[PDB]
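Structural prep section.
Before we set up the soaks we want a predicted structure of the protein with magnesium ion in place, mainly to decide which crystallisation condition to try first. Input record follows.
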Amino acid sequence: TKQFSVPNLPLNVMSNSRVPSLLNAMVVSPDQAQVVQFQNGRCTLDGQMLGTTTVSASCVARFRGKTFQAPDNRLGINLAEISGEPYHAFESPAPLGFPDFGDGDWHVTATKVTPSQLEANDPVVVGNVQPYNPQFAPHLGTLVVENPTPDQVATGTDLLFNITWLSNRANNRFNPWVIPNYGSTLTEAAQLAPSIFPPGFGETIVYFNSTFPAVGATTHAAIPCLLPQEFVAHFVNEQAPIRGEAALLHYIDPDTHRNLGEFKIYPEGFVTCVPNVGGTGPQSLPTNGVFVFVSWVSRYYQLKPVGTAG
Amino acid sequence: TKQFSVPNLPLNVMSNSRVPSLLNAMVVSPDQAQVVQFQNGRCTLDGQMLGTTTVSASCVARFRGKTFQAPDNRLGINLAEISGEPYHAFESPAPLGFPDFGDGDWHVTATKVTPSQLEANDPVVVGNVQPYNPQFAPHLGTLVVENPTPDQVATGTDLLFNITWLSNRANNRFNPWVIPNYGSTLTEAAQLAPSIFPPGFGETIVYFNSTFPAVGATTHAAIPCLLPQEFVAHFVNEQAPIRGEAALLHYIDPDTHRNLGEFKIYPEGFVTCVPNVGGTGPQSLPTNGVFVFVSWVSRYYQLKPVGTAG
Ligand SMILES: [Mg+2]
Ligand SMILES: [Mg+2]
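Run finished without errors. Recording the tokens verbatim:
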């Protein structure tokens, strides 16, 4: 009897579910239909998180671990959960909130997190992680920070990492759709979030974009996700049972209360629309509108085209 | 008719409202009754944000601005909203989410956020901000980054700042209770969030702590706030009208479903308890509990003592 709903927050005050950044656009990208299989920002409408998705905004694209010495003054990290609690293999693709970009270097800023180690001195370690590296092994709980500054960190130092920025590999552009390779030890419990395939009825997936310091990107500094983090947090909180084949949303201009566009959000946890032919679809709408639940609908409910025709 | 409620997320998956960090403790601190007047994490039960509080988790203690050249290779920043929207004086204490730590140096890591400036090259600028500096003028929209690296940043470059860590002033310890001096030009619309005075009936204010890289702190690397960010996001979303003098919450083991403690959350937007005398109050309780609304109550409802005797 718990009815379903979405947070009624304006889009442009909601946040990405794959980087800790404000949302400032929504787009569609039908043509370049490469695999859609993000591991963060994944949640069912009844509030089950998938892949590495956490409910915790402050964990999105953060990783934590203890240091050990690797060959050639590389700084090995034994991952734990950001909460500090241990990370064990064979249960999830990677720790909760672990970043899901596989196509470029991560330039990272870490601090120490042990209170005893925080009463004096500089707590910062900086470096970069290469998800294409052979020693990148997040499912089994270990990765390698190339080029650490400082060059020598004591073993067993507890470090919390942020992604300061992302950069392309040499002579490629950084594709933020591409998820990492988590390892080859994939148990059924630890399975990746499934890929999402195009929905039919002339619908196309809607991505919520963020401007983010992603250098040399295929998208010009824009990180897409399928769900605002606030939606994830909302579904996990509400646990509203699924009572239909999809959920029709209206994107409302909040003051004038007029309908700016029709969307469907599917039980698997992704949004779609029908773009007005030959136009940008939802991207031309004001980013200060609000999403409201209208009703459950069937998969074949036909959406009115959204946007202008170019 | 919209009934009041709190997010029913376990405390240790919710986040700080004054730094972007996971919560990992709740404490009381009666005796050292320094003024309680945080500007972030302030929100009424019917969802009116106060001081500099934003709803956007990814804006908590982040600031944005455009560079100009100040004397002696200092880096001046003309503040804007993190969204990019211009910041004007006389309306708010400071931009939304602006950090409210006055008692220590902020060591900051910024990136360029202009997409054209992110097709190539390193986009990082680091430095430190000194709230006690005479050029620290956040209400009027300007501050200075001391010791920038790089030393010369082109004028008018758009930079998004994070606080990597906080450090004490020399010969002092860093008190995270201390809010900045925002300026002298403080109009009525731009008034600070009021300070909170202890509530009577043997009650004391409950603080939600995070471990955070705050070096040399008076609290051993712990940042307190009055409300989890998720609460703020919840009250703003719900807009449930105030229908009593206080709201009684139970803190529930979400397994056993048993009552771990009684709390009141007041309309002005803070939580209290009655510590069992001679103990830490709520600090001994497990941190995986969940808050649930029971009923509105009057101010003189007497809470059962929380915690052990010590
Ligand atoms: Mg899992
Ligand atoms: Mg204001």
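Observations: Residues B 92 surround magnesium ion (ligand 2) (CB under 6 Å).
Flagged for discussion at group meeting.
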